Design an enzyme around this catalytic site. Structure first.
Site, mmCIF file in Angstrom:
data_model
loop_
_atom_site.group_PDB
_atom_site.id
_atom_site.type_symbol
_atom_site.label_atom_id
_atom_site.label_comp_id
_atom_site.label_asym_id
_atom_site.label_seq_id
_atom_site.Cartn_x
_atom_site.Cartn_y
_atom_site.Cartn_z
ATOM 1 N N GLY B 32 0.904 -1.294 0.047
ATOM 2 C CA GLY B 32 0.053 -0.083 -0.046
ATOM 3 C C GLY B 32 0.988 1.196 -0.055
ATOM 4 O O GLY B 32 2.105 1.226 0.424
ATOM 5 N N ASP B 153 -5.654 8.706 14.369
ATOM 6 C CA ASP B 153 -6.134 8.316 13.215
ATOM 7 C C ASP B 153 -6.814 6.827 13.138
ATOM 8 O O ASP B 153 -6.504 5.948 12.408
ATOM 9 C CB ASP B 153 -4.783 8.378 12.133
ATOM 10 C CG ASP B 153 -5.055 8.534 10.948
ATOM 11 O OD1 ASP B 153 -6.483 8.615 10.533
ATOM 12 O OD2 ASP B 153 -4.226 8.498 10.037
ATOM 13 N N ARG B 157 -9.461 1.400 7.999
ATOM 14 C CA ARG B 157 -8.188 1.389 6.992
ATOM 15 C C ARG B 157 -6.772 1.152 7.644
ATOM 16 O O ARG B 157 -5.549 0.867 7.156
ATOM 17 C CB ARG B 157 -8.092 2.712 5.989
ATOM 18 C CG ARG B 157 -7.948 3.948 6.710
ATOM 19 C CD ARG B 157 -7.884 5.075 5.782
ATOM 20 N NE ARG B 157 -7.650 6.264 6.848
ATOM 21 C CZ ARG B 157 -8.825 6.580 7.433
ATOM 22 N NH1 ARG B 157 -10.059 6.338 7.106
ATOM 23 N NH2 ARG B 157 -8.812 7.599 8.196
ATOM 24 N N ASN B 158 -6.672 1.753 8.936
ATOM 25 C CA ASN B 158 -5.490 1.779 9.914
ATOM 26 C C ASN B 158 -5.323 0.668 10.940
ATOM 27 O O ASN B 158 -4.615 0.855 11.858
ATOM 28 C CB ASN B 158 -5.436 3.131 10.568
ATOM 29 C CG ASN B 158 -4.997 4.242 9.617
ATOM 30 O OD1 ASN B 158 -4.507 3.928 8.508
ATOM 31 N ND2 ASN B 158 -5.609 5.413 9.868
ATOM 32 N N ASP B 171 -0.333 2.363 11.704
ATOM 33 C CA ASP B 171 -0.325 3.808 11.238
ATOM 34 C C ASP B 171 -0.411 4.819 12.442
ATOM 35 O O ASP B 171 -1.311 5.544 12.672
ATOM 36 C CB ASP B 171 -1.326 3.880 10.343
ATOM 37 C CG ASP B 171 -1.371 3.102 8.882
ATOM 38 O OD1 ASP B 171 -2.366 2.693 8.579
ATOM 39 O OD2 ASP B 171 -0.353 3.067 8.409
HETATM 40 N N1 LIG Z 1 3.126 0.875 11.149
HETATM 41 C C1 LIG Z 1 2.473 0.849 9.956
HETATM 42 O O1 LIG Z 1 1.701 1.846 9.848
HETATM 43 C C2 LIG Z 1 2.518 -0.396 9.249
HETATM 44 C C3 LIG Z 1 1.542 -0.581 8.123
HETATM 45 C C4 LIG Z 1 1.327 -1.859 7.689
HETATM 46 C C5 LIG Z 1 1.945 -2.880 7.711
HETATM 47 C C6 LIG Z 1 1.809 -4.061 7.410
HETATM 48 C C7 LIG Z 1 1.940 -5.441 7.758
HETATM 49 N N2 LIG Z 1 1.301 -6.356 7.239
HETATM 50 N N3 LIG Z 1 0.670 -5.648 6.051
HETATM 51 C C8 LIG Z 1 0.024 -6.389 4.965
HETATM 52 C C9 LIG Z 1 -0.923 -5.623 4.289
HETATM 53 C C10 LIG Z 1 -0.565 -4.050 4.470
HETATM 54 N N4 LIG Z 1 -1.094 -3.308 3.508
HETATM 55 C C11 LIG Z 1 -1.100 -1.805 3.410
HETATM 56 C C12 LIG Z 1 -1.626 -1.356 4.818
HETATM 57 C C13 LIG Z 1 -2.861 -1.649 5.191
HETATM 58 C C14 LIG Z 1 -3.227 -1.185 6.490
HETATM 59 C C15 LIG Z 1 -2.640 0.087 6.967
HETATM 60 N N5 LIG Z 1 -1.483 0.619 6.383
HETATM 61 C C16 LIG Z 1 -1.108 0.099 5.118
HETATM 62 N N6 LIG Z 1 0.147 -3.532 5.287
HETATM 63 C C17 LIG Z 1 0.981 -4.578 6.100
HETATM 64 C C18 LIG Z 1 2.627 -2.939 8.964
HETATM 65 C C19 LIG Z 1 2.799 -1.739 9.597
#
Ligand SMILES: NC(=O)c1ccc(-c2cnn3ccc(NCc4cccnc4)nc23)cc1
Ligand SMILES: NC(=O)c1ccc(-c2cnn3ccc(NCc4cccnc4)nc23)cc1
Lengths: 292, 292
Positions: B32, B153, B157-158, B171
């Site tokens: 993403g 936030d 989605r987060n 997030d």
């Molecule tokens: N610290 C962080 O913000 C963070 C963010 C995302 C991840 C992360 C770990 N596994 N995974 C699988 C799909 C994914 N899809 C994008 C997405 C989805 C929800 C929210 N943000 C992005 N993301 C992930 C791990 C940590």
């Protein structure tokens, strides 16, 4: 807060000059989505006394808009209302009743200057075509500087190319009035990409016409490289130490000594040692008449 | 300024606890790109004493990162270093030398809760599965509230969905410490989507655990609607007048009187009239044991 006041003030503003009937506006394909919001291609019936449909661009809020984005859309409407120059994109109107806020903009056939240049080579462009592009953008910036506006976000992605390959400065969401102070300063971190920011903007959060001059220099490098990526392969967090230790981008290939001299002058540490846009335009005029 | 200090301080921080060798990290497909930055799927050799490769997510700056985005990445690293709860996504390490800043995160197989829910129906989920999801997220928020962190936030989605359908709050770019004041307040406009912000955040720029409680209520509505779009068809600029005149989202279809009562309580004008997360968890526990 400041935004609730702007929204309410704007929502009661009885401005027939700018208000356009929603029913006379038809939206089409998305042209782009970014920090500038969402821009769609559209057509407007009986816009600004012109009989029939006019092809236009419409700027609007993206999905899940923040206060930041709403504030920037209202700010841009307020700025572009008062601006009129052949090298700045025009506001034609807005729809602010019975649906989302829509700003109706002049349409630029060729899209972004970054796109136009990356699509091309040497489409075949000469050094004279490039100097022309830079000059047109310098003229618009001289006008904005005279109006006491700091754009803050000058880059090839925020220049549009209209019919006749006419440059239009775009994306006024971050532009600020500086009549009072001749500087704009924010406590919080800015949303301008690091690699286009002047050293005093990056370290001290100071925005002036002369920080616009710095950005123009990066834009010059973008133009000369036909849409290159500034400080290529260098992470943005290294720009603090890189700039502070006196480093700048190398003279790129297919760039004159005079053209690179202008870039370097735009990136002087001391804002007062940088040229003003009027000087920049004179330096570009000189290069043109000497021959490409 | 504040960011140059953070970047330099972080770039000399000799923290073997968090520093991971770049050569032991292999990046793959993009998971993403948004306000949270860029997240890629990746694999790490000999991470945290574990023999062999571990599948991980890596967060990094998007193209043309602003100070804002760099500040948020460094802020998240600093927060997640000190956080440890089964319903909050884990930091495993960072690569901060000889290349771009990379944060190495726990991998959540199913991606975003918004995606997971929109993919499903009634995948077949029960009201009990939904109450479980909400409860798990309430537990994590109770822990963050106790640590004096405001997420700011909170939205579907987060939230990430990991193996066993275990919720992970995600997030932390906008999350802020409130040990000093029990409130976080910013002069400038926030980057949280309007439709998730508490009325006092939207008007007065005041962020507290109780504004997180408001956001949780919108998240509850998202969960109950299996990833609905809050205040559907209402432009975000109308949320000022809508919220101020006492309006809230209607009870959605397939929602109990008790479940909707909890949403409404989360959206009380007066933050002190809202439940705390411990209360929210007790209200959800009660719904579960009564049966879906
Ligand atoms: N610290 C962080 O913000 C963070 C963010 C995302 C991840 C992360 C770990 N596994 N995974 C699988 C799909 C994914 N899809 C994008 C997405 C989805 C929800 C929210 N943000 C992005 N993301 C992930 C791990 C940590
Ligand atoms: N006030 C404004 O910011 C604005 C922005 C864009 C337009 C606009 C007019 N014609 N057109 C054609 C393509 C296009 N592609 C997206 C894009 C490109 C460069 C920069 N931003 C977006 N955009 C346009 C007009 C006004």
């Amino acid at each position: 807060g400041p935004l609730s006041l702007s929204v309410d003030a704007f929502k009661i503003l009885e401005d027939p000059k700018w208000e356009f009937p929603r029913k006379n506006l038809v939206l089409g394909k998305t042209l782009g989505e970014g920090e500038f919001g969402k821009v769609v291609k559209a057509t407007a019936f009986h816009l600004k006394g012109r009989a029939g449909y006019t092809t236009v661009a419409v700027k609007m809020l993206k999905e899940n808009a923040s206060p930041s984005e709403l504030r920037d859309l209202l700010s841009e409407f307020n700025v572009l209302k008062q601006v009129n120059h052949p090298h700045v994109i025009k506001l034609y109107g807005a729809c602010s009743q019975d649906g989302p806020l829509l700003l109706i903009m002049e349409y630029a056939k060729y899209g972004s200057l970054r796109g136009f240049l990356r699509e091309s080579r040497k489409r075949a462009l000469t050094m004279g075509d490039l100097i022309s592009f830079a000059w047109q953008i310098s003229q618009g910036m001289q006008y904005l500087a005279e109006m006491k506006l700091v754009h803050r976000d000058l880059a090839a992605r925020n220049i549009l190319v209209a019919e006749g390959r006419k440059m239009k400065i775009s994306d006024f969401g971050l532009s600020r009035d500086v009549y009072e102070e001749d500087s704009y300063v924010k406590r919080s971190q800015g949303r301008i990409p690091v690699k286009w920011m002047a050293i005093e903007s990056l370290f001290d959060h100071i925005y002036t016409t002369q920080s616009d001059v710095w950005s123009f220099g990066v834009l010059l490098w973008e133009i000369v490289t036909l849409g290159g990526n500034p400080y290529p392969g260098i992470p943005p967090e290294r720009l603090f130490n890189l700039l502070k230790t006196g480093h700048r981008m190398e003279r790129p290939d297919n760039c004159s000594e005079e053209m690179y001299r202008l870039m370097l002058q735009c990136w002087k540490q001391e804002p007062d040692k940088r040229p003003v846009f009027a000087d920049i335009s004179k330096d570009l005029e000189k290069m043109m008449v000497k021959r490409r």
